[PDB]
A paper describes a structure:
Dinucleases of the DEDD superfamily, such as [name], Rexo2 and nanoRNase C, catalyze the essential final step of RNA degradation, the conversion of di- to mononucleotides. The active sites of these enzymes are optimized for substrates that are two nucleotides long, and do not discriminate between RNA and DNA. The active sites invariably consist of (i) a catalytic DEDDh/y-containing core for divalent cation coordination and catalysis, (ii) a leucine residue that wedges between the two bases of the substrates and (iii) a 5′-phosphate cap that coordinates the 5′ phosphate of the dinucleotides. Here, we identified a novel DEDD subfamily, members of which function as dedicated deoxydinucleases (diDNases) that specifically hydrolyze single-stranded DNA dinucleotides in a sequence-independent manner.
To confirm that Actinomycetal [name] proteins function as dinucleases, we measured the in vitro and in vivo activities of [name] from Blastococcus (OrnBla) and Nocardioides (OrnNoc). Actinomycetal [name] proteins readily cleaved both the RNA and DNA dinucleotides in vitro. A comparison of their kinetic parameters with those of previously studied [name] homologs from Gammaproteobacteria V. cholerae and P. aeruginosa, OrnVc and OrnPa, respectively, revealed that OrnVc did not distinguish between RNA and DNA dinucleotides and that OrnPa, OrnBla, and OrnNoc had a slight bias toward diribonucleotides. Given that OrnBla and OrnNoc were able to rescue the small-colony phenotype of the P. aeruginosa Δ[name] strain to the same extent as OrnPa, our results suggest a conserved cellular role for [name] proteins as housekeeping dinucleases. The crystal structure of OrnBla in complex with [name] further confirmed a conserved mode of substrate coordination across the bacterial [name] family, including homologs from Gram-positive species. Structural superposition of OrnBla-[name] and OrnVc-[name] showed that the sugar-phosphate backbones of the substrates aligned perfectly. Neither structure revealed elements in the active sites that would restrict the space for the 2′OH group of the nucleotide's ribose. The residues of the active sites facing the substrate sugars are hydrophilic and can accommodate both deoxyribose and ribose. The only significant structural difference between OrnBla and OrnVc is the additional C-terminal helix of the former, which is far from the active site and has been previously reported to stabilize the dimeric assembly of [name] from M. smegmatis.
Author numbering:
A (entry chain A): 5 to 209
B (entry chain G): 0 to 208
Write the structure that this text describes.
């Protein structure tokens, strides 16, 4: 409960049938978003044919970051990278199905991890904390907060990306969420009873 | 444009023969539309999708039991609706509120699981929805850590594993969080947001250097 696993993946594209996983960065925070270790950033080998298949937008970002040339030199396999990520996570989260996976639009990463790294996929809780869910809520409920987001960076790797995901959530914690510990038990029970009453007729049909 | 975000939210809950994206079948899809303030705009759509007798007999004991007890299995057996037909019905329904593709987030509890089945079986619907999603369970997990009394006060959900009631309870859960763990609208001023952004940028700058 006291730890969050953050992952950002890079791919040759978004297609779960055809595209390859070429980078996995992993970061651990506690439940208060304190970063517990500098993180891991693993560059996974893919063949030149797979890299030649990237579309213009993906080929361009991975060229500008230098990722593609690093992928070409790497000998790390998906199975080797999975064992490295699993051991790293277990230093802080030894028990399986206890820590959620966290990131921006993190379900996309999870799909590639479920396909390529089943042992890691099963070690993480199925629940995830999608920072972009909060982003899109703020976009509608608190538009000035949405437009005030910290600017995210250019031409950097997956590890910098996942750190900026934590920073974005730390920004929302200071702006759109109430102060901890939050409402009292009586206040929470009252709010729950209000929305139960407000949704009762719709639920009854 | 894809920079535009729709003021309406699309909510979907699915039932399946199991969680395996290779082997399991989509057998129920419920769809609900809300405005940004979580007002439900229509009673919702609930589609029972046919699945072969083999797929139903191959359900594991946990899933076979839940879909028997809810009546879903008998409904699936009686249904003649295909996934392609259900997909076109879902699209026509959503487009009454969200006509532009890639503008409305998909919303639910652990909605990435539903999205994987939609991407596999309903590619046109998958493309019409924004890739971004509002996972109410992400807020639930934040409440567990930052607001535990709100976490323990969540309204009790039904255990029926039926798609329309369950997606309505997902909206109700987010409405609960809106009143408990989110600040009052309109929220921070521009100046307050700038200060908070500067604080976290300063806080993470060395790590990102
Ligand atoms: Na990402
Ligand atoms: Na990235
Ligand atoms: Na569900």
């Amino acid at each position: 409960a006291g730890h969050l696993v953050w992952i950002d993946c890079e791919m040759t594209g978004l297609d779960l049938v055809e595209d390859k996983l070429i980078e996995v960065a992993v970061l651990i925070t506690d439940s208060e978003l304190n970063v517990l270790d500098p993180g891991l950033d693993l560059i996974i080998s893919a063949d030149d044919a797979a890299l030649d298949g990237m579309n213009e937008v993906v080929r361009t970002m991975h060229e500008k970051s230098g990722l593609t040339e690093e992928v070409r030199a790497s000998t790390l396999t998906v199975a080797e990278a999975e064992q490295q990520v699993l051991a790293y996570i277990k230093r802080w989260v030894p028990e399986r199905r206890t820590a959620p996976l966290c990131g921006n639009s993190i379900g996309t990463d999870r799909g590639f991890l479920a396909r390529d790294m089943p042992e890691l996929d099963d070690h993480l809780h199925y629940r995830m904390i999608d920072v972009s869910s909060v982003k899109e809520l703020a976009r509608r409920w608190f538009p000035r907060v949405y437009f005030g987001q910290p600017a995210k960076g250019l031409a950097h790797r997956a590890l910098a990306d996942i750190i900026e995901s934590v920073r974005e959530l730390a920004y929302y914690r200071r702006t759109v969420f109430v102060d901890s510990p939050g409402p009292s038990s009586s206040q929470a029970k009252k709010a729950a009873a209000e929305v139960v009453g407000g949704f009762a007729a719709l639920l009854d049909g």
